[PDB]
């Protein structure tokens, strides 16, 4: 389902992602834009036999379980398939855990590349929230 910036921004604010840890909404909506382009259903394979799932592209080696990745730690303790739903809660709950490992949002390739050090509050400019 392709979310749309301020619709996603509202849903994420509601789910406590505004200043979660100390990252304002714009970071999360930014990551969601460059990781998945707001499409909940997005999957992508990586070079080790693991796939990235959903809107926040949480990977199956470390974070969720998809029944076929070698080395599955499944830290978020959720089936990866649950991350593909049109309501972002299993993805937001797993995202809260990823941030809590003492590495911040660096865990997200596209937040790093396209959102670290940018004016991330542009991502909610003109959004009702």
């Amino acid at each position: 389902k392709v979310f749309g910036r301020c619709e996603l921004a509202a849903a994420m604010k509601r789910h406590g992602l505004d200043n979660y840890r100390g990252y304002s909404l714009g970071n999360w909506v930014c990551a969601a834009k460059f990781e998945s382009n707001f499409n909940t259903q997005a999957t992508n394979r990586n070079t080790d036999g693991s796939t990235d799932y959903g809107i926040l592209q949480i990977n199956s080696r470390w974070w969720c379980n998809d029944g076929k990745t070698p080395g599955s730690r499944n830290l978020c303790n959720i089936p990866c398939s649950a991350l593909l739903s049109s309501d972002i809660t299993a993805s937001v709950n797993c995202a809260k855990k990823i941030v809590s490992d003492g590495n911040g949002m660096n865990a997200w390739v596209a937040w790093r590349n396209r959102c670290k050090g940018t004016d991330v509050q542009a991502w909610i400019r003109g959004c009702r929230l």
Partner: antibody, heavy 115, light 106 residues
Framework: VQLQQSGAELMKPGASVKISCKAS????????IEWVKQRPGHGLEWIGEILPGSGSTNYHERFKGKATFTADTSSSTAYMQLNSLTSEDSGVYYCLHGNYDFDGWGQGTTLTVSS | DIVLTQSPAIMSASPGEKVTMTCSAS?????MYWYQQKSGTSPKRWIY???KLASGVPVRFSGSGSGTSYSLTISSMETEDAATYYCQQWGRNPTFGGGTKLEIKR
């Protein structure tokens, strides 16, 4: 149950064909089904795959645009549509499973593209 | 992504003989998968996650390797191991090797 596929097809160049994979026997929604092409003489090519429950689809560079996968949740069927069929599309197409609970393959649908 | 090459193309072997076929990858792969095909039927996943034997593979098969060079080894060759064994890197976008046909010598 099984992974039962469609029978062989004969198609002209330019047309599009759709192949069924009736994957019955488990929670369909939950497991990726992969599709592979065997050109007798070249061997195997990996086309892509679909996770029927969400409809998340992953393709190999070479087939993004030649292939489209869909799944009908109510008949436990996955479909692979191959479009703009050319002579090089003739081959045996397999649907399969590659996970730790089961790794079954189907027998293949042979496709011949000729006039 | 990676190009995989299987040495050699066809091999002869008697029963009781030890067989090792090799699959090399043009760039490092994290794991390898071997499938067998008997002419007449679909491929069957034989070895997965480099060394794990799929359901029904006799224990006499083993897979090994790392980075670039991987292999499948049959200790006592038996007649029903005559097939083509293909290897595959199942990374960002999978590729299979050209196979190694195993036919028995008589």
């Amino acid at each position: 149950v099984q992974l039962q596929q469609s029978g062989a097809e004969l198609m002209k160049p330019g047309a599009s064909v759709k192949i069924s994979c009736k994957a019955s026997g488990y929670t369909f929604s939950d497991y990726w089904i992969e599709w592979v092409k065997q050109r007798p003489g070249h061997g195997l090519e990996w086309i892509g795959e679909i996770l029927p429950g969400s409809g998340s689809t992953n393709y190999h560079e070479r087939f993004k645009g030649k292939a489209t996968f869909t799944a009908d949740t109510s008949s436990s069927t996955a479909y692979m549509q191959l479009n703009s069929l050319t002579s090089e599309d003739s081959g045996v197409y397999y649907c399969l499973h590659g996970n730790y609970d089961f790794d079954g393959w189907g027998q293949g649908t042979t496709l011949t593209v000729s006039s | 992504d990676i190009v995989l090459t299987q040495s050699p193309a066809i091999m002869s072997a008697s029963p009781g003989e030890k067989v090792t076929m090799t699959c090399s990858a043009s760039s490092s792969v994290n794991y390898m998968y071997w499938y067998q095909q008997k002419s007449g039927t679909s491929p069957k996943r034989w070895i997965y996650d480099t060394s794990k034997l799929a359901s029904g593979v006799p224990v006499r098969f083993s897979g090994s390797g790392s980075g670039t060079s991987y292999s499948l080894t049959i200790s006592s060759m038996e007649t029903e191991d005559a097939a083509t064994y293909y290897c595959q890197q199942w990374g960002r976008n999978p590729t299979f090797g050209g196979g190694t046909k195993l036919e028995i010598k008589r």
